Design a protein around this ligand. Structure first.
Ligand code: R07
Ligand code: MN
Ligand code: MN
Length: 179
């Protein structure tokens, strides 16, 4: 039982922890062993939820946080209703306002590297990419950041607080040296 596991459980909302645990076990992975991956999945999950809470009431369908089958079910309904092409890879949200899927990224390296990595993987000129770093940078497809500055600033503040909280516990370096 690691210090990182206990930190995660006190740092993140219980529903977030439970969803992250479920995600990991869906692919056979142990949150008690892959503890940096645990923290990362919780973080990404919270970002996705804060992101969908930006903007107006019915704006985003949340794909992330569901099991594989239901996530693709929702993607299928979105495609077979809006006519948007079916992504090769599961995204994180759908924007009913802009009519595009969103892939959220949270990285401990420069937003540039990670954006290039995700863009080359999906390759769809369709799925919108939005990367946040733990240093407060962000990078988004076609310089279009979807949300208000205020809703994005909230996410960046939260990411930096997670980083400080890891640091005060001497877990940050292991977390960063694991991505
Ligand atoms: C399963 C879905 N994944 C994979 N993987 C994911 C995950 C989930 C469970 C077990 C292992 C891993 C790899 S590590 C990681 C780290 C942080 C956040 C999410 C995750 N992703 C990494 C970055 C993302 O932005 C993202 O959306 C995912 C994601 O959604 C998929 F798309 F493949 F179906
Ligand atoms: Mn995802
Ligand atoms: Mn993502």
């Amino acid at each position: 039982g690691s210090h990182m596991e206990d930190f995660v459980r006190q740092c993140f909302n219980p529903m977030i922890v439970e969803l992250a645990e479920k995600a990991m076990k869906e692919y056979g992975e142990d949150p008690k062993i892959e503890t940096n991956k645990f923290a990362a999945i919780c973080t990404h999950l919270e970002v996705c939820f804060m992101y969908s809470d930006g903007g107006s009431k019915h704006r985003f369908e949340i794909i992330e946080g569901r099991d594989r089958i239901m996530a693709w079910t929702v993607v299928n309904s979105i495609c077979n209703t809006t006519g948007v092409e079916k992504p090769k890879f599961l995204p994180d949200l759908y924007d009913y306002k802009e009519n595009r899927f969103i892939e959220i990224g949270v990285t401990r390296r420069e937003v540039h590297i990670y954006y290039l990595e995700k863009a080359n993987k999906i390759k769809s000129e369709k799925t919108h990419i939005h990367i946040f770093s733990f240093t407060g940078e962000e990078m988004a497809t076609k310089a279009d950041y979807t949300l208000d500055e205020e809703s994005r600033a909230r996410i960046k503040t939260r990411l930096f607080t997670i980083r400080q909280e890891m640091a005060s516990r001497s877990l940050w370096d292991s977390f960063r040296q694991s991505e």
